[PDB]
Amino acid sequence: KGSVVLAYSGGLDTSCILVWLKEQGYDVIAYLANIGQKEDFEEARKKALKLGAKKVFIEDVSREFVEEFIWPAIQSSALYEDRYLLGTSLARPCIARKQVEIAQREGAKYVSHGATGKGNDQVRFELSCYSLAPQIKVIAPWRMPEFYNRFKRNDLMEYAKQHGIPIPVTPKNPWSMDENLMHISYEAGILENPKNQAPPGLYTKTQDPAKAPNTPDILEIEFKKGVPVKVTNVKDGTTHQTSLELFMYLNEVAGKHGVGRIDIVENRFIGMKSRGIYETPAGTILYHAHLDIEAFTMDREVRKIKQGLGLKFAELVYTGFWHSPECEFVRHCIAKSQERVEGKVQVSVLKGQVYILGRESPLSLYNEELVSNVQGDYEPTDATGFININSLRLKEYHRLQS
Amino acid sequence: KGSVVLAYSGGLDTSCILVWLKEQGYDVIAYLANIGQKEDFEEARKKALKLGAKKVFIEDVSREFVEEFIWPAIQSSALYEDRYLLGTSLARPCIARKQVEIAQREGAKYVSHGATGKGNDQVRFELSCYSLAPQIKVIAPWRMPEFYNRFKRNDLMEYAKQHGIPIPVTPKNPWSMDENLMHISYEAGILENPKNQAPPGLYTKTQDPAKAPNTPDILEIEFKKGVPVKVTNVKDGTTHQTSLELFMYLNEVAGKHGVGRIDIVENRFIGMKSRGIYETPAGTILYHAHLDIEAFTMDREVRKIKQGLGLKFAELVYTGFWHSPECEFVRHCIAKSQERVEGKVQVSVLKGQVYILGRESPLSLYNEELVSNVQGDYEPTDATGFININSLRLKEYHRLQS
Amino acid sequence: KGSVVLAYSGGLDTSCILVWLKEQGYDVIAYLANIGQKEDFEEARKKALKLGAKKVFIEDVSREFVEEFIWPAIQSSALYEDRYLLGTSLARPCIARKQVEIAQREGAKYVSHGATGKGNDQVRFELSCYSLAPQIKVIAPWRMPEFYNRFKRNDLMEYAKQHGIPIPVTPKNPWSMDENLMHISYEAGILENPKNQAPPGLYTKTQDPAKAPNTPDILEIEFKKGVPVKVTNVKDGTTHQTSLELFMYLNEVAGKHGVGRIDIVENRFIGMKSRGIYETPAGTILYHAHLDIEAFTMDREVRKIKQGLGLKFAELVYTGFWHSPECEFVRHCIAKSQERVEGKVQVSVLKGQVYILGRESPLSLYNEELVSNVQGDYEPTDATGFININSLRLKEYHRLQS
Amino acid sequence: KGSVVLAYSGGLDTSCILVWLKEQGYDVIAYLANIGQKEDFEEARKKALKLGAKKVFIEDVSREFVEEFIWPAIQSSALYEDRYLLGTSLARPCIARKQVEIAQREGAKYVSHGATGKGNDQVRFELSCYSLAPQIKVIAPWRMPEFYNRFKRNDLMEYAKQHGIPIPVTPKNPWSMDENLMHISYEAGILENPKNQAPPGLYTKTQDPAKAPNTPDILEIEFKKGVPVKVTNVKDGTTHQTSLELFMYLNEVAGKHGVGRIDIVENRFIGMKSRGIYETPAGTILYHAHLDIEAFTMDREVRKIKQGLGLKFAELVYTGFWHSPECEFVRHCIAKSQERVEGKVQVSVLKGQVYILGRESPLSLYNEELVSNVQGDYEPTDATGFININSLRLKEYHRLQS
Numbered sequence A, B, C, D: 001k002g003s004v005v006l007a008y009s010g011g012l013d014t015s016c017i018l019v020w021l022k023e024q025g026y027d028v029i030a031y032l033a034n035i036g037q038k039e040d041f042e043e044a045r046k047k048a049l050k051l052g053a054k055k056v057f058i059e060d061v062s063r064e065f066v067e068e069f070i071w072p073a074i075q076s077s078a079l080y081e082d083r084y085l086l087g088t089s090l091a092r093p094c095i096a097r098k099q100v101e102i103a104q105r106e107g108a109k110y111v112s113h114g115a116t117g118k119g120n121d122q123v124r125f126e127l128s129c130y131s132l133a134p135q136i137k138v139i140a141p142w143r144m145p146e147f148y149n150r151f152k153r154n155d156l157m158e159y160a161k162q163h164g165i166p167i168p169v170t171p172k173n174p175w176s177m178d179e180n181l182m183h184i185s186y187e188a189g190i191l192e193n194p195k196n197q198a199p200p201g202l203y204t205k206t207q208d209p210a211k212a213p214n215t216p217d218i219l220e221i222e223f224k225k226g227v228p229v230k231v232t233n234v235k236d237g238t239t240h241q242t243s244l245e246l247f248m249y250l251n252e253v254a255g256k257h258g259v260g261r262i263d264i265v266e267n268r269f270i271g272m273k274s275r276g277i278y279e280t281p282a283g284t285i286l287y288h289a290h291l292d293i294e295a296f297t298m299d300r301e302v303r304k305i306k307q308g309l310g311l312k313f314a315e316l317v318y319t320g321f322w323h324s325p326e327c328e329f330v331r332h333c334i335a336k337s338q339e340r341v342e343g344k345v346q347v348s349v350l351k352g353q354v355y356i357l358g359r360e361s362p363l364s365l366y367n368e369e370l371v372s373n374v375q376g377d378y379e380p381t382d383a384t385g386f387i388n389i390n391s392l393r394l395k396e397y398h399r400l401q402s
């Protein structure tokens, strides 16, 4: 009994959980985070009311998702375990934070979610909830015996049918999906056998690289403070100079050319290896563009220190520690390194690949004249000394193990 | 005076240097490292004799280049500054080591090279020479005033003409190339303006992704101890189970599909930023395949420690410290992590991109049953404790800065 | 019901737990790890039998504790959070491993321990048990509601009195102690207020530095492969050339001079900060001696890579991950670095401090002649080049943010 | 010819260099950095004028040395190679910066110093000079053939005698000293044999721990933002609440009790190992006090990230890169971590050792109640889940290499 804010999506799990928490005594507040997925939110709201929700909040959270979450992730220049661009992992603290906000506003003692007992997301939601509101209580049905021993997915379907929970007819895929503005992830079902290949009908956000356009899209991406501020199509003249709008245009450009597809096995914070395929179109373009622009504008030695911090950032976000003193310090250090990260990157998007074509920047650390056929401000005799003393170690070390 | 072993390639710089060291008193031993480039070595030998070389050594160094250099680089899973696969950087210690070997055999007091005063390669050659033979002497003409002030590239052409040094007619490109078995690099001339895009005729080793085959090549790559031992084409049945032969077939497959192209600005050991484009076809396939197979067969926590070592490996190789106690220790630690890195990766090569399709391994750390819709060996109640104590910090830290 | 191997010490907690597990249905095997503490093990055995133990194992585990645990810890050159020498943290995997060994021999389905619910040791025992024997079951009464809600320390005393559990008369100190061969730790009770100073009667293993001898003890410590193999007193001639015997002599020497005292606040694996004072006499001498000898015999760059691994080692041991693939890999890498770590360190032990006096080694990387008033094998002109190119960055970076 | 600012100390080397640069055509500006050493600066000024200096600048640089250099070094909590507190290494950028400032004011084209060709200090002076003023020119006589081949220390003495350069009568020690406010270092001569022990008359700044007071000094040190702001003697009531004054009082307290003595072999930026003994009295107290106060007030995970940065700081300072973008970024990150580092540490100074006695802070992350015999805000059942899922890896990893 009391009021619970449930992170609700409209699917079987969270439809059932709504009804279940209601059967258990709770007044349920259905909370629909609109984060760039393809939902008919109004109908999901109607469905939630029919199901017995006391209240429905649809929060459009896309712009702040781009600007407060995706932007620092690009600044980081880092990939979880050298492959994962963190699409879902970034979204959870964005979702959880608004959920806590709705709960404290409503005077609700409990929050709730439909994440499974073997996942990362359970951790991410709940670490942010406790971090931001130490006194909130969580109900995670998939970790409740009374719940998880009863619905041992076809047991859940039956539960739906018995309580008149509607099942869309659209029909089910033998995997689960997570979709937001940044990516789409597909993970259970048939994909659990890491020997088995994605069927072609799996890929919903990117074109098949064999069907993709024959002409590339050539874009110019402008950065300031490590994040994109402008996208212009060099050919057709299209321009976007606001965050969400440029990001979606990059999704639409990259998806059109089949860009952003990975197939990976990853290691889950609880310690299970999991097999996932991902579609991160815009994220893939920006990952590469940003690397090129920070490398052009950053000191060599700042960069290696900064990249260690990013690596740390990637692991903290993946495991669910966005709202922590350590990720806050790390985000601050990463932000600081990006002060001069600005300029323009020319890129080409074609057949499932992004290509860097050129770059320029008024804050460039590049010196065309110095690296030159012409001399210039350099003494070749210096280098001789530099080599010769770097070798002293090296010649010691040989003579003395000889 | 005395005998000098010159790392000779047959191009303008090292043709001129041969003649110059000869004019200076030295007996010149011309040393042609055959490392998978496209030279007519026999003619380069003839050219070296005509030029006044006392002696010519052509060393076919390809197999040991793959097995002793490229193999540990793949084990490392690392990229210099997140982009560079180290093609040229790996080759130098292979070349320098054989040069020192030829010099000590011949009783030659000096070795020599045609690397410029602003490069990485000068460092790599000479650090390995001193490391392996502390008493050898180096002649690096590009760092000698008597030499570099006189040939302030058209001054070098004149020198050639005046000493009857032949100039191929093939004509010059407004950039310099470095080619070996692993890659091709292009760097000076027009490419020095990082705003300027590679002209299409630049790309000699990879197909244009717009001209590349419409059907992919699907390959199965087998690893053992972190390095490829087998490549089989799933369609046409082609099989290679020896190191050099599988590597070249992967070059030929990846080059055919336009795979392995980068355009980057990098930071040079002497501290100048430089602009380079690279073609690393096989290297690009193996980079991705190996990542997938180590991730499937490696403990999560071994992996992050191991990846720090790889990062260290990448920097040590780039800067020229292959032959050092620190790179030796690092290579040893990296090798040790790879003991269980084995299995089979299914990959697709199409339109300038490599795709992972699936993987399997008898040393897999994957548990299909555990990660599953079915229960299994897991207690969902555990995770609740795991979350709740990970939050204790986190809730402390909020209350106490409140 | 069934048989349980209880890590038993003879104190109130584990005396009560013995009786409690017996009341609960279990046959209790009392397991006394002799690890260099000051117990009357035979009487603790008698006490355990009187209490209803089916069986008593006293295992003298000291020599293997020194040689398999303390030795790799010294090789590591690392301190948990720059202060803690890990005395108790090292002991647990030594104790747990023998416990699992006794349990599997006996055909016992369960193991048990008296560690509290807020500690590190619960984690260390149980992570090693599961790691070494995935199928064993743990009973940790302090985490059982039926147990911990009933004995909310005076409730435990009453339980003792009501079951005729003997209480020594020796009387209690308002803190808890953990003692082994390596150290003694004191932690709860009055010490929980980190503002409060240790009372003088707290310190049982080290002399008060104000009462300590006026003449120092000067010792020569010999290392091989990073671990001490010989201790000789320079004055009185005492010599120990076996592991356990030299270690105890160093405890006895350091304790005599008041060496090895710390007072720290540390952060506990579950995330609570805790206040602890420690006495690690021999450990403190060896920490300093070994640092001096590895620094004399190790390459500069091997050292920083190695020290990162040690840091990792310290955290893995503190948190309870000795028996893990990551600590195993790290111990292996650390061992490998120590191959040349050998020689002789002259040290002085006086008034709560250790002093390094000198050192020597046939595997020294020191060059007296080179570092010299005399020239020698060096070119001062080299250094000029080395400085000048290290500055190129540095001068770039100024001009280009000017 | 032209004007040169020489970092002058008044000793044989820099007295001779003054006269030599004058003989070579230059107008010499003698620059005496007063950095807390024991010079009679007025007489050194008189000596410099007699010697032919056009000008003499005595700069009292002590307060800014403490506040801008030593303070960030304490914030760092780090030791070069786990032993060296960086006394001399910190001073050089302080000295070099004022030298560049004097040179640019005077319109002097050149700066100069008497550091040897095999040292660290040559690097530190000159990297800061170039970093701060890319166009200045350096004269480093010890790297000039015309100079260093002529004064092959008794050749320098003769040079003095022949030019009427006064030699103090005080007589020479068979080692060189470097002294400032932070420490004293002794290094060449007899100490070059790392087997040889410091003679007792070597130690000028610290009492012999055998002669040191029988009663300790108990001090309370207050920190704010990671740096000491107050020192009060608990017994005698002495109080210092300004930076330089508290630092000197801590030198005077620690020196009185024999605190701050080390004997080490270190590895020099050019790659030679060197043997040095150091006396860092106040630095030693503050190193330990600050560690205790940051550990009490810092998040566990902020701390390990922060300590990596400090480690980086220590190496950047030792090698001479204070004035670099990477040390600037690192100092900024380190400063940021210290925002909450504040409170009071009770310490005891006795017989060559410092002891932590207690600590307190209004920004404490310590929770007496939580870590407690009393329950409190904790669920012991949580920890069971935390252990059990930390073991899942661990049990996997065993079954799958079984």
Ligand SMILES: NC(=O)NCCC[C@H](N)C(=O)O
Binding pocket: A086, A088, A089, A120, A121, A176, A177, A178, A185, A186, A187, A188, A266, A274, A276
């Ligand atoms: N389909 C999903 O449920 N995706 C969520 C998990 C995706 C990815 N493994 C992650 O942990 O962020």
Ligand SMILES: NC(=O)NCCC[C@H](N)C(=O)O
Binding pocket: B086, B088, B089, B120, B121, B176, B177, B178, B185, B186, B187, B188, B266, B274, B276
């Ligand atoms: N074209 C070339 O001369 N390539 C050699 C340099 C390539 C790359 N920047 C490297 O340093 O390894």
Ligand SMILES: NC(=O)NCCC[C@H](N)C(=O)O
Binding pocket: C086, C088, C089, C120, C121, C176, C177, C178, C185, C186, C187, C188, C266, C274, C276
């Ligand atoms: N007195 C004790 O119970 N000592 C055990 C804990 C000591 C130290 N904090 C550790 O965790 O290893």
Ligand SMILES: NC(=O)NCCC[C@H](N)C(=O)O
Binding pocket: D086, D088, D089, D120, D121, D176, D177, D178, D185, D186, D187, D188, D266, D274, D276
């Ligand atoms: N006596 C000295 O000349 N000391 C300066 C060097 C001390 C120490 N090895 C350092 O490099 O900072």
Ligand SMILES: N[C@@H](CC(=O)O)C(=O)O
Binding pocket: A114, A115, A116, A117, A118, A119, A120, A121, A122, A178, A268
């Ligand atoms: N969202 C999925 C996967 C994950 O959380 O990592 C789950 O709840 O199981």
Ligand SMILES: N[C@@H](CC(=O)O)C(=O)O
Binding pocket: B114, B115, B116, B117, B118, B119, B120, B121, B122, B178, B268
């Ligand atoms: N090989 C080229 C580039 C390099 O060495 O990095 C040179 O000698 O300048």
Ligand SMILES: N[C@@H](CC(=O)O)C(=O)O
Binding pocket: C114, C115, C116, C117, C118, C119, C120, C121, C122, C178, C268
């Ligand atoms: N041994 C003590 C302290 C610790 O484990 O860290 C306990 O059980 O609580």
Ligand SMILES: N[C@@H](CC(=O)O)C(=O)O
Binding pocket: D114, D115, D116, D117, D118, D119, D120, D121, D122, D178, D268
């Ligand atoms: N100051 C001494 C030592 C050093 O610089 O490290 C020298 O000039 O040689």
Ligand code: NA
Binding pocket: A104, A133, A134, A135, A136
């Ligand atoms: Na709340």
Ligand code: NA
Binding pocket: B104, B133, B134, B135, B136
């Ligand atoms: Na030789």
Ligand code: NA
Binding pocket: C104, C133, C134, C135, C136
């Ligand atoms: Na078992």
Ligand code: NA
Binding pocket: D104, D133, D134, D135, D136
């Ligand atoms: Na200037």
